[PDB]
Amino acid sequence: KVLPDAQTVTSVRHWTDTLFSFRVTRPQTLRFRSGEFVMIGLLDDNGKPIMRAYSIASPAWDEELEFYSIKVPDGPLTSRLQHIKVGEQIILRPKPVGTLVIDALLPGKRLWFLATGTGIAPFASLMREPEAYEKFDEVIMMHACRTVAELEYGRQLVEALQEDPLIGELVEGKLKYYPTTTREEFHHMGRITDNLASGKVFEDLGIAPMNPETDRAMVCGSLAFNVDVMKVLESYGLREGANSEPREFVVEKAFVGEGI
């Protein structure tokens, strides 16, 4: 059974028939930076581990670890994981890594989180990271999904941040949220690549145009989504970097392959 690096589910919350979030106890010695991912999983029928990469959806200070997950019909992990219940366990490898970290960027004045689908997961972490509002004056969350229902987890998160009297102040008109659908009717629509290139996002939010001097960005989507967004960023004069030589943006795959 689930014994290796076992942690315990403390809460579960379903959002759509393809999306759910959950939280589990944190390993005692685990330390990470907001944005990083880890390996989790469950045993298959024969007792073999089914391991998968997951961004930690909670910020570094949170006492429990949060995850925002797809539900793949017939997906080896999530076909099983979607039916997880409080009190049940999961395997968790306490080896955080990744390049969606503030340290992997040149310091600047504005920070952009550019995501689609479950790619908002590392930004559910980072948007709740103190350092994000310390090192930057403005934090822009662009989230693009096909439907209004897929935006809800993210929408509730940002609502909680903007309303809470304490955080609401600490995040003093710094956090800007721009959700869009690409298929379903919604007050705000369009692909991140198009809304960034056209300059429409700037008019809607009422913000200064993208500037390589000051703007820094993180991209988390399908490989296809990362490619297109890289181009638009580079058109603005921003260059890809990392911990080795930090520049103005970083990208990570929300998953491998084509996507649900």
Ligand X SMILES: Cc1cc2nc3c(=O)[nH]c(=O)nc-3n(C[C@H](O)[C@H](O)[C@H](O)COP(=O)(O)OP(=O)(O)OC[C@H]3O[C@@H](n4cnc5c(N)ncnc54)[C@H](O)[C@@H]3O)c2cc1C
Closest distance between ligand X and the C-beta of residue 229, in Å?
16
76 part of the interface to ligand X, by CB under 6 A: yes
Contact status, residue 94 vs residue 120, Cβ threshold 8 Å? no
227 part of the interface to ligand X, by CB under 6 A: no
Tell me whether residue 69 or residue 226 sits nearer to ligand X (CB atom): 69
Please enumerate, by residue number, every residue annotated as part of a binding site for NADP(+): 116, 146, 182-183, 191, 228
Side-chain-side CA neighbours of 75 within 13 Å: the count stands at 22
70 part of the interface to ligand X, by CB under 6 A: yes
55 part of the interface to ligand X, by CB under 6 A: yes
CA distance 116 to 219: 9
Closest distance between ligand X and the C-beta of residue 77, in Å?
4
Contacts of 193 (CB under 8 A, 6+ apart): 225, 228, 229, 231, 232
Candidates 58-66, 69-77, 86-94, 183-191: pick the segment binding ligand X (CB under 6 A). 69-77
Angle, CA of 162, 154 and 237, to the nearest 5°: 90
* Stretch 104-143 residues interacting with ligand X (CB under 6 A): 117-118, 121
Tell me whether residue 24 or residue 210 sits nearer to ligand X (CB atom): 24
CA distance 145 to 19: 12
The residues binding ligand X (CB under 6 A) are 37, 52-55, 68-70, 72, 75-79, 117-118, 121, 252-260
